[PDB]
Structure formats: C-alpha cells, structure tokens
Design a protein around this ligand. Structure first.
Ligand SMILES: OC[C@H]1O[C@@H](S[C@H]2[C@H](O)[C@@H](O)[C@H](O)O[C@@H]2CO)[C@H](O)[C@@H](O)[C@@H]1O
Length: 445
C-alpha cells in the first residue's frame, strides 16, 4: 500500500509575491491593486493588508535556505509587477535587483525556479487607466514581460504566465471579491479576455526571444457535482463547470469560448465585441504544460435568483478545512481524468498549487497539523492513481511554503507548511513539512 512516484517527478513548493514579500513601499515599489482594495471596509477579514506579511523581502535568503534544508528541488514564486513598473514605462532597477538576488540565492542552494509573471498584483497606476477592462493594459503587460525575460530567461527553467485568470477577472471585476473590487459582469468577461491574451502575449515574447525554459499557464479548476438528479440541478452544475473551468480552458486549447456559456451570458458579452481578429488565435497556446491549482469540489443546485449563474453551492460541512472547504480527494482524481480527456489530451500537467488551511496551534516548538496532513497525503494518492492509470502528471507544488496574507481571508487563515509567527517573523516548520521532506526522500510514501 505504498505510493511511489516517477523518478523524474517534480516535487516543489510555491508562494505569491504580494502574499509574502512585504516591503510594499520599499525599493521603488508603488501600490498594487490589492494595497488599495484591502483598505475598503469589509473587503478583507480584519481589515488586514499585505503590509509586511512574512517580510520575505528581507528574509529571502533564510527562506530559500529553509527550502533546501527542507528537501525541495523546485520553487515557484511570482514577480510583483509593481516593483518592476512602478509607473508608465519607467523600469525600476532596484526591483529587478531584488529578484536577481533571489535567483542567486535559489541557484546557490541548488533549486530549480519557476517564475510566475502575474499573480494578481496589478500596479494601481494601471487600474487607474482602467486596469484589465482596457485592452491597452495588454501592451503594459508586454512591456513588463519583455523586461523579465530579457533580464533573466537564461536562468529560468520554467515560465508560469498567468495564475488563475478566473479569480483576477470574475472575482476581481465581477463579484467584487478580489481586487480591484468591481461588480460588473461586462468588465469581468472583458478582463478575462484581456488576461488570457496576456498568456498568449508572453508566449509570443517567449518564442520570439528564443527562450528554452518550458512555459505554461495555470488555471484553478474545481470538480463539479450536481446536488441531486433533478434536471435543473444537473443544468446548474453544467453552468458552474463552464463558469470556472470551460470558460478559460476552452479558449486555451480549442480556441473558443463555451457556446452555452456565451449563450447564457446574454447581453453581458455585448455581442463578444471585445474580441478582435487574432485574439482567440493569440490565446490558444497551451504551451509546454498545463498548470493546475485544485482545492475542493463544488456540489451545485439551481436557484431562480438575481445572480449571474443562478446556481447555489451546497455547503458540505463534511470533512472541511479551516475555510469551510470540503475535502474530497476522489474529486481531484476525477478532475485530473476529465482534464486529460478534454483539453490537455497528453500534454504534461503540473499541479502548481494544492494544500489546505487548518487551525494551527504551536505546541513545544512544533505544529501537529495532522489535518493538513491528512489532506496532502490523501490528494497525493489521488495524483498517484491518475498516474499509474496513464495520466501525464509530471509535478506537484504544495501550496504555500509559508503562512501568508490569504487574500480576502487576510491572515485569519494559514496555508503554509512552515508556520510564521507574525509577532517575531520567525519560521518554524510544521509536522507536514517534515513529512513532506521524508516523503520526497523516498520519492513516495
Ligand atoms: O485565499 C486562499 C486561497 O484561495 C484560492 S482561489 C479560491 C477563491 O477565493 C474562492 O472564492 C473559490 O470559492 O475557490 C477558489 C479555489 O477553490 C487560491 O487558488 C489560493 O492560491 C489561495 O491561497
């Protein structure tokens, strides 16, 4: 009953720049959309902001060393657009220097980096111009992505372009739940089209510059089950699946948007007027691999309410994380299977994010996060069954090396395998982290 993974399998850990760096107003960095958003009353639990966070801006050498020490060969992180383009066409050298050094430290410990271009921290000055609702924002991205590839690229083995287009567009402009916080479906779908284009943009810059590092986008995806055998519930579930998965996965592989969702979004798509000749072609670039972020499944039922989808999520109080997120490892296996069948059909799949937030309690310098634990192991068995059955899973990055600013949840939630004491900033590996070390050692469990 042991679970062994390929010899070539990629074992990593990942983070996000705004979620851990801190030093928000240091080194030339100008405010990102989240620095603003977090000030809006009621948007983030406790009113928390990304100020300081894990202060990884100052503790990076210790952190990376802590990774090496923890047995990690791969590390996915993101570049804060704000540190690079603090204003229109400027280019802060002090920002690039920070990452360059980070890379010196990474390579010095013998780790393999994966740089994520955009992880939701859009410069405020750009949102002022209209942010993602403006096609003009795409050129701003081109500028940003070009500098990053010119300054590095030779040392970047893996390029992760956009992280969860869904969240940055639907939640950021549609539901108002993520920065910048707009509530306008017309803008959400427009923003979703512009951010997907940026993946194509960075893909074109990639090949144009002749880089050798693999490249790909990351899509957060969730398995969807109908709440009952009732027709409308099955209909509801289909709608949720197209809302989060198909709307972003379809254009990336099939060069088109889900016909049914397009039909359903009626007047909100405004005749799909934000699409221009070439856009879909630009977007349809799977690249070298598909990055996936999975956390939980969705159980849907239908409603006849005033919301966009008219779908209701059943709240399975069953095994759940500190976020109320149900733990259903079977669904992860089911999603991975479905993704290979449609979309990827063979292409290498990479899990750029997977983990959980449980209530942590520090006991005698140790965190017995058995829970987080029963979560990573169980989902890894899911990943093991997908392989063994022919799945193309080539890597897994446990999400959140460090506890961090958990977006709308603020610091009220802990996703790390390394516990952060915010009063002192000291790092203390949790039991799950040690388990992961011994796990990667036997390359299985
Ligand atoms: O904030 C913790 C964790 O969030 C997710 S994305 C998350 C959306 O916030 C939520 O509204 C929706 O129901 O589910 C998705 C995923 O199931 C993000 O991927 C992760 O990086 C972050 O640490």
């Amino acid at each position: 009953n042991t679970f062994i993974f390929p010899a070539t399998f990629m074992w990593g850990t990942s983070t996000s720049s705004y979620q851990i760096e801190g030093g928000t107003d240091e080194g030339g960095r100008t405010p990102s959309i989240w620095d603003t958003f977090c000030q809006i009353p009621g948007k983030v639990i406790g009113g928390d902001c990304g100020d300081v966070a894990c202060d990884h801006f100052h503790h990076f050498k210790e952190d990376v060393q802590l990774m090496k020490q923890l047995g990690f060969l791969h590390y996915r992180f993101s570049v804060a657009w704000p540190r690079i383009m603090p204003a229109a066409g400027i280019i802060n050298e002090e920002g690039l220097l920070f990452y360059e050094h980070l890379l010196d430290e990474i390579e010095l410990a013998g780790l393999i980096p994966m740089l994520t271009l955009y992880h939701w921290d859009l410069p405020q000055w750009i949102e002022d111009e209209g942010g993602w609702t403006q096609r003009e924002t795409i050129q701003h991205f081109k500028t940003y992505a070009s500098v990053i590839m010119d300054r590095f690229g030779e040392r970047i083995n893996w390029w992760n372009t956009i992280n969860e287009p869904y969240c940055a567009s639907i939640l950021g402009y549609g539901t108002g739940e993520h920065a910048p916080g707009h509530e306008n479906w017309r803008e959400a779908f427009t923003a979703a089209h512009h951010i997907l284009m940026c993946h194509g943009i960075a893909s074109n810059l990639h090949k144009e510059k002749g880089l050798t590092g693999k490249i790909g986008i990351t899509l957060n995806m969730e398995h969807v089950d109908a709440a009952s055998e009732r027709p409308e519930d099955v209909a509801a579930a289909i709608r949720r699946d197209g809302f989060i998965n198909r709307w972003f996965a379809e254009p990336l592989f099939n060069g088109k948007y889900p016909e049914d969702m397009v039909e359903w979004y009626g007047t909100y798509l405004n005749g799909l007027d934000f699409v221009q000749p070439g856009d879909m072609e630009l977007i349809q670039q799977p690249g070298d691999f598909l990055g996936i972020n999975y956390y939980t499944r969705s159980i849907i039922r239908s409603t006849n309410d005033a919301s966009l989808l008219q779908v209701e999520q059943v709240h399975m109080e069953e095994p759940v994380t500190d976020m109320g997120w149900e733990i259903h490892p079977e669904s992860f296996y089911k999603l991975l299977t479905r993704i290979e069948k449609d979309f990827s059909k063979g292409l290498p799949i990479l899990i750029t994010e997977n983990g959980a937030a449980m209530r942590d309690e520090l006991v005698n310098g140790q965190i017995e996060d058995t829970g987080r634990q029963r979560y990573i192991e169980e989902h890894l068995k899911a990943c093991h069954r997908f392989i063994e059955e022919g799945g193309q899973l080539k890597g897994y990055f446990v999400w959140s090396f460090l506890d961090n600013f958990e977006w709308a949840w603020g610091y009220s939630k802990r996703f790390g395998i390394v516990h952060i004491n915010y009063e002192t900033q000291e790092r203390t590996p949790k039991q799950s982290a040690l388990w992961f070390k011994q796990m990667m050692a036997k390359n299985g469990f």
